[PDB]
Design a protein around this ligand. Structure first.
Ligand code: UTP
Ligand code: UTP
Ligand code: UTP
Ligand code: UTP
Ligand code: UTP
Ligand code: UTP
Ligand code: MG
Ligand code: MG
Ligand code: MG
Ligand code: MG
Ligand code: MG
Ligand code: MG
Lengths: 535, 535, 535
């Protein structure tokens, strides 16, 4: 029989930006490779109910789950390292917790009580942590739930989360709950020494709020010597086997090997009394060979509205690299500001030396003339094109304009357009997984190797069906639709006209994993390798 | 010219229930008696947006301000000690702050930002503290704003409030901001010693979150000796003149004298560089003579739905005592459960030895047959009656039933009544101050000594005007109405039928002060003294 | 009239090794250059009563003051940056404080009291801090006492010192006491960001023990941007003018310019209400030109017993560089292990490419055959030699052996020597300043430009006077003695035999300053420049 679901909390000390999320994901990968059913959850101390109101060009992309929740980009790291679909419950924010509790209070659901941080707010957080241990849709209960606590220990914002995690430990006991604390071991260049004092003080602050760490992640720019690990084991009263030297890794994919060398995952398995099995390194060693030993390089333009923050297109960038890994190729991303591609000379200067053009999503942006300009250039140049959501819409708009509908546009970007080739169906916001049926022998069906697929959506604008016959005059095919045929889901040009020009209303990058590249990104990068070889 | 408005923060350490609110109010009284314009504010760390969802029979009454806000009962203590009307802004809750910030976030008012505890929550609290320093309706800016911080220092719930108060100090400087910290000095009976260690540790916790106390309130069951005050001055680094021995007082009205003997108010005035003037003791010494030296006693029944928690009727109980003070009388409150007054024998057992019957408000209660039974008994017995809100409604229902409308009731308590003598005008919830016009020479006009008054309301049910002629058959007079005459505001019987049976739709107790008794409570207690003398 | 002596406490947070001592010294230099009388003191939390029991080859040199106290090497940094003689009271250790208090307790001096950390230990520390504000021998009372608190805030070992400093502030008031806190602002290379969180948490720990910092030293590997300084000013509630970006400097002599650019010294002067005067940069700008713009280079061997820790010979190394500065020369120190110089081929390999040989002191070492070997090589080679304490003794031993006393030695290193040319006078340990009278026209009198000098000693072995005539057969002159002529203080060879071979029983390096090079080191480096030019 399966033992109780274990809870492993990941907290951070000293300072943020130490990479707690990627350490947690890498531990999730190691435990998954040991045959454990691992799920992950992020507690975000921000008040935004969902990250949809945040500027993604400052704060990073919005990740969308199968069930349609808009979440912190960390859920994307979890899905990529676990190769698993996570529920919307995998991202809890202070905003969610407080508005749920306040809304219940206003309805009289606390029956005359004074509604308090303890127990009402901490009960809500605890409820959301414990919900992760419920059996999934297939009927499976996880072995381990890894919960990452955002914010830094000693700060005000994470106090209700840390209190809830302390109560989870109190109610489930030490056998079912593990605390992993991430700290910084700074190097002082004038004296040449590494310092353990910040970890010593951070662990005392963690202990002061009632939490005893079982293990410590020592984030450092170099190996932490055994003498320093011994000092930390003694001063922080942590088993020496739980004191983990975690030096900065060359790639994010190398972090599981760093943690495994320090035997963190074997310590976790023994401490939580989990079924023991050796790590099966087959899948991850294969990824690492594709990461560190590519056989060729290919340049891809990512034509984003704003490209100074790569995290705004993190899942797209990861899906492009994963497409490369499948071909044993290194994808070099050429970050191109879409505003520079509006004119033919601007698009030529920006895209003249690339091998493929990716037009990503642009939820909430204004001004798409640069994205349309990039597609017009790529079509004339013979460059492969992959359009995602706004990308498909731009492929459809450019096709309509190429056949005489000069002022064709989306009613989203030009409400006064005489030809709204993209329009609402107010309409309906489509979030999360939606099924699509593909034309057999189409470019998209050949890429997927099936005619029945599902992809995640985040949009309310659709191809206007009144324009299908007029748009098709360009040779553009509506090669994928909703099962009833009403909604256009995929577009493509015939391969005799353009070897690879594909659009999707969805975000296939979200279902990409470094160990499981998405079929559309594999076909796109493959077409980019073909273009390079032809040139 | 008037100097900058000063902010005086009152925090609590060691444990709650030490009486921070009454200490703050008493300091507000002392500063007011020095001719300073003082306003007060309570920061409540509970999530209830307003205390309307709290059971008042567990948590205490809801106070209503002139502008119609439903607030914590502490605002009532502030109004009573300051003799001033406070704005709805005088009560800030965590619930208010978080729902305001989350609602702004959902509307996109933070323009793409990550919404955080610091600065977004603390900016909202700071905004609400600084709003208290704005000029009032008459154009006057306060000299001092006393802000009471609910919760205890070292607890999670008060951390955003304490951080906001620390930022107020940072931005206004030490000259305009004063920190008063309330602590416990426990007595250990086996060793016979008072202990300063809890104050020492509480002040270190206060300092740890960035606040330096200017003065300390040492709450104790006896005088704190000079040697202990010297130890605290040294260990807490507080001026000895700011170390205040605050032993438990015999009455709440004695606390200003306790603080004045220790010269706390003179220390505050000097430390904040406020205009100096001696306390004018005329008004408070007069109150203390009425408190400690009554010339007679009078027994009043307070016929409440639930009477085990006196704080559920705090403003009523204070208004009854203030009515007594005006007559140099001691009002002994006989707390009577209304459910025991439904039958004539039950009402006789409960009210047979009282001199007056007060029927208070009952916002949100169910089952008023006991309150109607108490009025029927009091009318037959010749007992004075004062009804407040639900009290007037019960006087009107009992009058209607005494003239043949056997099933007369409020549609609130019996929706199926064939005679809804009390009904909505859904209707309109009337909150805060409303003007009333009184019949000249009526009992109510003679009590007020004017025909034009205003009182605070908290109700949506009104006297049904279709029943005025039928109800008047009992001899009941509609002696007070809204200015247009549409809404019944006051009822009374003629003095030749009952010497004092008065109802009001409002809560006059809220406008009562111990130094300014409300005219209706003065007339009611006076009628109770008359009944006692006649018996 | 002179205002009250000010106390400026320097504490450290986050981690040790940030350079608190050199920051404090540099501030002492800036205040001295403003015409203020500044004195400095180090509080060391170690239990060693004096650093004499510490291995200097692990922990650094022992500094000796004029009054003969053996102190932490930090006193040497203070003397060098202030150009002032400090009393033995300038170094307080936990060992000193506890043994003084325990010794008084054992004698019954606390008259029946329970002897406690507070107040008995903290009174002793406070006494030692306040003693620094007493008028000196010349009758002058300092303007400022800078007290450096060793250990890190949040650690156990510095708690009594920090408590004493908090009591100094309590008793003298905020006008006479200033707190400077040194913190670390680490850089995280993967994200490219500087982090203020460790300073935020360190200042909260400092505040928690009752201390409010007036200013912060932000130790960093680069400039701290204004946005981070603004964040720290707000979160730590420190005046923005007191938030000091202190990036790692190229030389220790550049730190005053770093602090002056951030206007720390002008902030200190204004905050403590000290007489204001601009920094006179004449002397320090002159030093910086000699530091950064040398006209030539000269190589000097420092023939130490153990040379892997340069701090074991810090004052010697600084005196050598200061000798270089006087000649506008860069002294390159060739760290030579003395054990490798015992044989003529070993000494040739080690000293063949140098321009001068310095034989430093060796209090407590064993095995001096390598130092004697280095002197024998340097004499034959024509290399300049400067011997300090053990160095003079080695010059005397080598001279005695060169004239037939083959087994000549010190009774310290060979008790069985038939010729103890160096011996005790048990004897008398000579510590601190001793006067010497110099032979007019001798090498040493020409270097000093006077025949009457004083130097600091740390030794009990002396030249055995029974051997003066025999040693003089080598041509060695006893060119300096005690005033009564009994003790040999200086030795030298005639310039016609060796241009510069000088020994001193004292430690002249201790009286060296970078702005005031010692005459013997100036003459030694000058002789090394002469040797280089001749080669
Ligand atoms: O264990 C780790 C984690 C992270 N990293 C390195 O740090 C980089 C940043 O890692 P993250 O993307 O996880 O940083 P973050 O700002 O989200 O950190 P938190 O506040 O969540 O703690 C990564 O891209 C990688 O280069 C490591 O080398 N090792
Ligand atoms: O909680 C503690 C830990 C240590 N100490 C004291 O710290 C002193 C050593 O001071 P360090 O700064 O060298 O600390 P560390 O070695 O523990 O840490 P890192 O260098 O790795 O940053 C020792 O003299 C010990 O008494 C405390 O006083 N309290
Ligand atoms: O300074 C004071 C305050 C209070 N008291 C006595 O304490 C009683 C309770 O005083 P409170 O009604 O103010 O208690 P509380 O529970 O609201 O306390 P906080 O959490 O707000 O701190 C009062 O009725 C009076 O008897 C004093 O004697 N002196
Ligand atoms: O660490 C904590 C514990 C509790 N609380 C908050 O304390 C509030 C209750 O405040 P109390 O003063 O009543 O505390 P208590 O019941 O825990 O202790 P005693 O009366 O027995 O002295 C609750 O509203 C809860 O949110 C914190 O904010 N932080
Ligand atoms: O303000 C400063 C102080 C120091 N330093 C640089 O740091 C080096 C080490 O400076 P220290 O010799 O003062 O380090 P430390 O180990 O004694 O530190 P504490 O525990 O006393 O705090 C110095 O030689 C210089 O290179 C700076 O650049 N700036
Ligand atoms: O005491 C505090 C300070 C700040 N915060 C919270 O810290 C969050 C920002 O988290 P950071 O890690 O970015 O902190 P910082 O900007 O203050 O410091 P550095 O990056 O310079 O190291 C904000 O969301 C704020 O609510 C606390 O909760 N408590
Ligand atoms: Mg992260
Ligand atoms: Mg150390
Ligand atoms: Mg209270
Ligand atoms: Mg005691
Ligand atoms: Mg130092
Ligand atoms: Mg930050």
């Amino acid at each position: 029989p399966q033992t109780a679901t274990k809870h492993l909390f990941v907290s951070g000390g000293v300072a943020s930006s130490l990479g707690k999320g990627l350490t947690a994901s890498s531990l999730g990968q190691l435990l998954t490779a040991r045959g454990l059913h691992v799920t992950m959850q992020k507690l975000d101390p921000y008040l935004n109910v969902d990250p949809g109101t945040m500027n993604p060009f400052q704060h990073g992309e919005v990740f969308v789950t199968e069930d349609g929740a808009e979440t912190d980009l960390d859920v994307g790291h979890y899905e990529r390292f676990l190769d698993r679909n996570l529920p919307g419950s995998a991202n809890v924010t202070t905003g969610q917790v407080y508005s749920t509790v306040i809304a219940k209070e206003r309805r009289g659901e606390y029956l005359g009580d004074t509604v308090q941080v303890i127990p009402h707010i901490t009960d809500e957080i605890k409820r959301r942590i414990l919900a992760m241990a419920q059996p999934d849709a297939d009927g499976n209960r996880p072995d381990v739930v890894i919960t990452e606590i955002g914010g830094t220990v000693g700060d005000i914002e994470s106090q209700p989360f840390l209190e809830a995690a302390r109560q989870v430990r109190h109610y489930l006991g030490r056998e079912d709950v593990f605390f992993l604390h991430v700290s910084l071991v700074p190097y002082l260049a004038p004296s040449g020494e590494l310092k353990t004092k910040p970890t010593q003080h951070s662990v005392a602050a963690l202990r002061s709020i009632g939490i005893t760490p079982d293990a410590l992640i020592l984030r450092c720019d170099r190996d932490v010597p055994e003498a320093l690990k011994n000092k930390i084991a003694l001063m922080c009263d942590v088993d020496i086997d739980g004191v983990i030297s975690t030096p900065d890794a060359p790639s994010i994919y190398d972090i599981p090997k760093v943690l495994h060398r320090e035997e963190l995952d074997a310590f976790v398995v023994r401490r939580l009394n989990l079924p023991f099995r050796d790590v099966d390194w087959t899948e991850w060693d294969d990824l690492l060979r594709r990461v560190h030993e590519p056989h060729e390089t290919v340049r891809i333009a990512l034509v984003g509205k704003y490209v100074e923050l790569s995290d705004a297109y993190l899942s797209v960038a990861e899906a492009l690299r994963a497409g490369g890994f499948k071909h044993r190729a290194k994808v070099e991303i050429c970050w191109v500001a879409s505003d520079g591609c509006e004119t033919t000379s601007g698009a030529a200067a920006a895209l003249g030396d690339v091998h493929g053009v990716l037009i990503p999503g642009g939820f909430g942006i204004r001004g798409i003339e640069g994205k349309i300009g990039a597609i017009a250039y790529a079509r004339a140049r013979g460059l492969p094109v992959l359009g995602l959501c706004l990308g498909l819409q731009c492929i459809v708009i450019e096709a309509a304009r190429s056949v005489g509908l000069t002022n064709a546009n989306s009613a989203e970007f030009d409400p006064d357009t005489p030809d709204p080739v993209i329009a609402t169906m107010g309409g309906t916001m489509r979030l999360g997984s939606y099924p699509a049926v593909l034309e057999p022998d189409s470019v998209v069906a050949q890429a997927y190797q099936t005619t029945q697929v599902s992809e995640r959506h985040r949009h309310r604008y659709e191809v206007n069906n009144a324009y299908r016959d007029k748009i098709a005059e360009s040779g553009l095919r509506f090669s994928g639709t909703s099962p009833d045929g009403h909604l256009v889901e995929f577009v493509e040009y015939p391969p005799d006209r353009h070897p690879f020009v594909v659009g999707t209303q969805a975000h296939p990058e979200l279902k990409s994993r470094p160990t499981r590249p998405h079929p559309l990104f594999v076909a796109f990068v493959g077409a980019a390798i073909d273009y390079k070889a032809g040139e």
